[PDB]
Chains A and B, each alone.
Chain A
């Protein structure tokens, strides 16, 4: 036995209270509008003209205020998010900057100059929705359970997906069709990205770059960098007999070419390179800060560049000849990008564009001037910045020419289908890889990710791993500095690289220091180094988000401090024992000694993906050994948000787990606390949501019991008459009539109307009365006297909602009344009339439709088991067992072995035991309750111990031989009903370009018949049916052709030969004649040859 502490499960709520699930999306923005907004400001602060050096601009300070709206004139009032969501406005706040401009002779400092607007998060620090109370949240018409984190642009909710990319400032060694190849990608703080690569062929190294035309030997670059003696080159490369035999060809090639001085080397580089100032100067500037930008040069010293290139050559030498390669699927190097850095680049580009634009408008007005004073405030606009930001957020196409980058599909509409789909959208992460079938590694589950990305959470279909979600315990590191770090490193006793020579780095005891892809220097006794660094990090002087690891194969220590890394808190162990004791958790239960105090007392610590590579972690406390360094807090944290709704995930299979994770966001339910006030395009509601009996701790962590999307129902696993096919499940008519599974659909209909540049306006006719009675016409029946429909009425098919009359050019108006399109008859809930930001009238209407479950609906069991309805079974059937309880939904026992789902039976058992006892049972992953203490509790009441009951059939009236599995199960209703997935078309609209049915079921179109089914018709041998339903019912046209000269005539008359004798008619589909008449513009004349079919 070992002392166990069953109290570390309360550390996770305390850690989630400060940050975690969705708060990091807001911290990425709050740190951005407080640091990076000032960073770009101090980047571009002074701009000067070119006409005369007397005019100049300066910036004092910049900041962003509170969300405000500019109404009719000189009226700034605080706006609410729901107000913008209902008026289709945009949630933005102005940016107040302090500018200084020198006009005439004196200097002017105009404070509080507005230059534009900028969107604000829903739960940011500058917004109103922060630090409030639920009573005050209800006064603003906003759900308090809304996690937020999205953008409101033109009355839609847009979320920016986190995107993963490869790390910069690093050396990669890959393998291709020829052999091994090394590469280095560099990107500094300024706008210049480079990608150099060293290739090996027939034992000769070559360097390739984007600006270089042909390959140049590495020894030439060495001699050009500044090292003259060839001995020092090999000395820097490596002091070994086998690395010198592989460097012989390069040495003899450098000796063959007449290159022995630095000037000759630079001349050769200038002759080789092509750029579209002599050759020596351009060759020197090309090697200074062009190929490698992440390595700064003080004046002209290439010593550090030489050392880096020597380490790269040694790496590519040690790689070649062995079976060691570096892979890109490793997540220790892959970095994440939030919405902060994208906004940073966008704002920097927009600010530079705005500074360069006004510089160009005020340069040709000073020479050709008519006054003595020139004010820059009058020649200023604040519309470009706002328009650019709004368009970049709405469209989602990040196009930056200064960075030379184009990205599409970054922002997506926030799915408001359910409460889980809305939160799960914030945790979605997309990859930069395209839809490639060939790639399988990155899609496959990687051993690197452990507790950072949920394995089960992934979409089923084409994207089988490209889309991933975060875990419960996950934190993204922000940006920091490196001054104190390098200072402490130099104080520890790290030697400078400029002191030692090339032969020392080859020594095994010698170790190199790497910091964000930069060689810090040489150090001995790296173990004491790492120990002291970790002690200083645990102390509190250095920030906690600093990663340090060691590599013995490469013999170097890596120090990672850049922003965008993955880390999760781990409990520290002290040589046989966790530092966390019971007295430390009793204080946390009391209310003191929070996560911050625990991190300040050296109790827990964050570790990176590469940092945990050099340590031993124990799962439980009984597994803790003498080599373990860190301890897992909770093992059920590995599962994701959508995976926390599955009872007993370890009992279920991974395909079923993935299916249930995919279907959890598809189930309909309650959206929030204000669902009747919000007016979205499509919304689904349930009637009476029940509470899950066997809930999970993750359910309580997110408070899913307050907005459930399912219902509990009695299930009996047994076969029925004829409708228990593999997924077909039957329903109970009496329960359906009582109201089990009643759903509601809500559709939005919005109509905007504005003015024009002339005096032409719009108007609404309204009701139309006849001469017989004083009642409205059948067309405008729901129309009221004003001109809009009244709420609380019923609209049938082909009914006018609102009368819209638009001027054609006193002016003649054309009537375009919007008509409701639907199969069933909807109902009117409410009508909202408001004004937009462009002084335009906007009328919104919400149409409700209550539906009931019928044959053809899709239901799920929250266990990866989806099924369509069978037959509706009445109440005379559904035999009772002993008391008179009828099965609500009969389940088929033939699909259980195929799916291999054992968690369903345990779920049913635990639910029955709970509903009998009267307390909810926990079913969390890697724990919960067993089947031994629950089986003995089901006996006290009087039922059978596991699942069996005596059932007497109701159809015949005799007892059943075998026993039936009865119990309550949590079911959920999904979308894709039979009423919407049902359409037919016989004769409707067609296209004008080609006479064929239109695409889509909303435009009354038909179905497509491709070659997939045409090959099946050909294999049979039927040709009349193939031409009947590809030519007769698709497109049939009569065309006249001449036999002498094949051409298209008209009314049996040719215009080329001028003869009426030679003429005939044929049946040709419109597509063929279309192609024949379209190919004539390519200087091609299709001449047909008519032959006698009879003879």
Chain B
């Protein structure tokens, strides 16, 4: 649903770079280049941002709205 706040294996906070990662994928950057410039070093806390789906945005279109 949402990006996890901490990693599952080690426990490093990777929930503070999802918006930065999204903003970095539109400035003519490579996936690996952006992931290395974000601050991730190993593949322990790198798969949380690379392979991650965003379904809450699709779930907000069905959310109740006030009129």
Q: Which residues of A contact B (CB under 8 A)?
A: 135, 138, 141, 670, 673-674, 676-677, 687-693, 705-706, 708, 712-714, 732, 734-735, 738-740, 883-886, 888, 912, 915-919, 968
Contact = CB atoms under 8 A, between A and B. Distances in A.
Interface in B27-67: 30-32, 35, 41-44, 46-47, 50-53, 55, 58-59, 61-62
A738 B47 contact: no
B11 A918 contact: no
Nearest to B61: A138
B53 A734 contact: no
Contacts of B50: 915, 918
Nearest to B58: A673
A918 B62 contact: no
Contacts of B31: 918-919
A391 B52 CA distance: 45
Interface string B2-14: 1010111111000
B1 interface: yes
A713 B51 contact: no
Contacts of B9: 714, 732, 734-735, 885-886, 888
B10 A886 contact: yes
Contacts of A919: 31-32
A688 B3 CA distance: 8
A738 B6 contact: yes
B22 to A, nearest CB: 15
Contact of B11 (A677, A690, A692, A734): A734
A677 B62 contact: yes
Contacts of A690: 47, 51-53
29 contacts: A138-B61, A138-B62, A673-B55, A673-B62, A676-B59, A677-B62, A688-B1, A688-B4, A691-B53, A693-B47, A705-B53, A714-B9, A732-B9, A738-B6, A739-B4, A739-B8, A740-B8, A883-B41, A883-B44, A885-B10, A885-B44, A886-B9, A886-B10, A888-B8, A915-B46, A915-B51, A916-B43, A918-B30, A968-B47
Contacts of A689: 1, 53, 55
Scoring B31, B51, B59 by chain A CB atoms within 10 A of each residue's CB, the highest score goes to: B51
A740 B8 CA distance: 6
B8 A917 contact: no
A714 B46 CA distance: 12
B43 A884 contact: no
Which 6 pairs of residues, A with B, have the shortest CB-CB distance?
Answer: A918-B32, A691-B51, A918-B31, A138-B61, A915-B43, A885-B44
Nearest to B32: A918
Contacts of B61: 135, 138
Contacts of A688: 1-2, 4
Contacts of A884: 10, 44
Given A673-B58, A714-B44, A918-B32, 7 more contacts: A689-B53, A691-B51, A691-B53, A886-B9, A915-B50, A918-B31, A919-B31
- Main SS of the interface on chain A? loop
B53 A738 contact: no
B45 to A, nearest CB: 9
Scoring B32, B43, B50, B53 by chain A CB atoms within 10 A of each residue's CB, the highest score goes to: B43
B4 to A, nearest CB: 6
Contacts of A676: 59, 62
A138 B64 CA distance: 12
Contacts of B53: 689-691, 705-706, 708
- Main SS of the interface on chain B? loop
Interface residues of B, number: 28
A714 B31 CA distance: 21
Interface of B: 1-2, 4, 6-11, 30-32, 35, 41-44, 46-47, 50-53, 55, 58-59, 61-62
A919 B51 CA distance: 10
Nearest to A677: B62
Contacts of A674: 62
B24 to A, nearest CB: 13
Nearest to B33: A918
Contacts of A738: 4, 6-8, 11
Given A673-B58, A673-B62, A674-B62, A693 B51 contact: yes
Nearest to B2: A688
Contact of B8 (A135, A706, A713): A713
Contacts of A692: 51
B49 to A, nearest CB: 10
Contacts of A708: 53
A687 B1 contact: yes
B41 to A, nearest CB: 8
Given A690-B47, A738-B8, A739-B4, A673 B59 contact: yes
A968 B43 contact: yes
Contacts of A691: 51-53
Contacts of A135: 61
Scoring B6, B31, B46, B55 by chain A CB atoms within 10 A of each residue's CB, the highest score goes to: B55
Given A138-B61, A885-B44, A712 B7 contact: no
Scoring A691, A738, A888 by chain B CB atoms within 10 A of each residue's CB, the highest score goes to: A738
B55 A918 contact: no
A706 B53 CA distance: 7
Scoring B4, B7, B53 by chain A CB atoms within 10 A of each residue's CB, the highest score goes to: B53
Given A676-B59, A735-B8, A712 B44 contact: no
A951 to B, nearest CB: 15
A115 B27 CA distance: 64
A689 B58 CA distance: 15
Nearest to A686: B1
Contacts of B41: 883
Contacts of A734: 9, 11
Nearest to B63: A676
A941 to B, nearest CB: 10
Nearest to A875: B11
A693 B6 CA distance: 20
A141 B62 contact: yes
Contacts of B52: 690-691
Nearest to A884: B10
B5 to A, nearest CB: 9
A712 B30 contact: no
Nearest to A883: B42
A490 B51 CA distance: 64
Given A138-B61, A673-B59, A883-B44, A712 B51 contact: yes
A673 B8 CA distance: 26
B35 to A, nearest CB: 6
B15 to A, nearest CB: 11
A708 B6 CA distance: 21
A689 B55 CA distance: 10
A671 to B, nearest CB: 11
B59 A912 contact: no
A914 to B, nearest CB: 9
Contacts of A888: 8-9
Contacts of B30: 918
Nearest to B36: A918
A968 B45 CA distance: 12
B8 A912 contact: no
Contacts of A714: 9, 44
Contacts of B46: 915
A706 B11 CA distance: 26
Contacts of B8: 713, 735, 738-740, 888
A945 B3 CA distance: 31
B25 to A, nearest CB: 11
Contacts of B1: 687-689
Contacts of A138: 61-62
A942 to B, nearest CB: 11
B67 to A, nearest CB: 13
A688 B15 CA distance: 13
A109 B31 CA distance: 72
Contacts of A735: 8-9
Contacts of B42: 883, 885
Given A677-B62, A691-B53, A738-B11, A917 B32 contact: yes
